[model samples]
Target: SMEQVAMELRLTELTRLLRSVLDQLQDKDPARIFAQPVSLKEVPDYLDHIKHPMDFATMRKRLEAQGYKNLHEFEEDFDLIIDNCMKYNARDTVFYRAAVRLRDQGGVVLRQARREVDSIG
Candidate 1:
């Protein structure tokens, strides 16, 4: 009975080692960890479709003027917003409050937006 018990314990340890190796392999492979990396452009487009409708052309141009061909920081911001909403348990209310800040603070979105157009000359 003691020999049988030792053999079973070894098998369990082997299984745990194998799982650890497989997990390490998967960690280095993004495809194995995540479904797929979506395009940065898709971020705003999808947000516009599912939430408030955004003027796609204008939004793209604004981002371009700000020297961003990709929605890098914004995607992170959106993720954090969702994370906050879920963590805070405020859901729609938290999102609306952010929307209020974004809307009311019109020039808050970008440094370029804060500059007056009349002074560009």
Candidate 2:
């Protein structure tokens, strides 16, 4: 029973930490374009080029569903969001630049999360 309680607590903490990261990203995006999935109607070839598309909405859904087992799994989806953007958009485009900014901001959040975890351990 004690172990189950501890595990539950750990999952709750992880969820909170992941939620904070997503909130930070949403706040950092001024245009708010990254808040949802890329429209397939707007970009007809999106699925053709990007094999694994990711977005904030999808990430939030996964998080709420407890799809992630750890912080690293959350980070993977975060990185995929940026990676898919970079792959689909040209370097000179605003979307590509936005992805760069997202990567930088996300990197800081993830590093801080890592430090927090390490300190607790």
Candidate 3:
């Protein structure tokens, strides 16, 4: 059955790599990490996400106004943040779950945000 086959698929390498990407792309994209040090590599995709440089300030304000006051929010807020980021700055939402979350459980709904996006590696 599908359940039996899917269970076996978890043992595959792609599934493992996918699990990691989901945590990063969708889970912990480090929205608040902007407080650390603004750079391209730490957040390669964000530069494009911004409009006027002050819009970067807007992103920080939005993050606070939304009450994202924890590491969990900091971690999972990347995708969530992007949604709001685009809404406010006239940018597009390219933070697709496929790049951030995995659909292994049920195509897309079961995936989680990346947990290591902010890890100091």
Q: Choose the strongest candidate by TM-score.
A: 2
Question: Top lDDT: which candidate number?
Answer: 2
Q: Once superposed on the true structure, which residue ranges of model 1 sit more than 4 Å away at CA?
A: 33-121
TM-score of every candidate relative to the true structure: 0.26, 0.90, 0.22
* Counted clashes in each candidate structure: 0, 0, 10
lDDT of 3: 0.38
Clashes of 2: 0
lDDT (CA) per prediction: 0.37, 0.84, 0.38
Write candidate 2's Cα lDDT for 7-62 as tens digits: 88888777877788778877777887688888889888888898888888999999
TM-score of decoy 1: 0.26
lDDT of 2: 0.84
Number of clashes in model 1?
0
By TM-score rank, best first, the candidates go: 2, 1, 3
Per-residue lDDT tens digits for candidate 1, residues 5-113, read 9766655553443334323322333322121322347554544333433222333344334423223433343344334334433536744454334333322333332
lDDT of 1 at 40: 41
After TM-score superposition, the amount by which residue 19's alpha carbon in candidate 1 deviates from its true location, in angstroms, is: 1.3
lDDT of 3 by residue, 1-90 (tens): 999776555334333443443344333334432223245576576556654332223434544354333334443434444343444333
What candidate 3 gets wrong by more than 4 Å, as runs, is 1-3, 6-15, 26-28, 31-81, 89-121
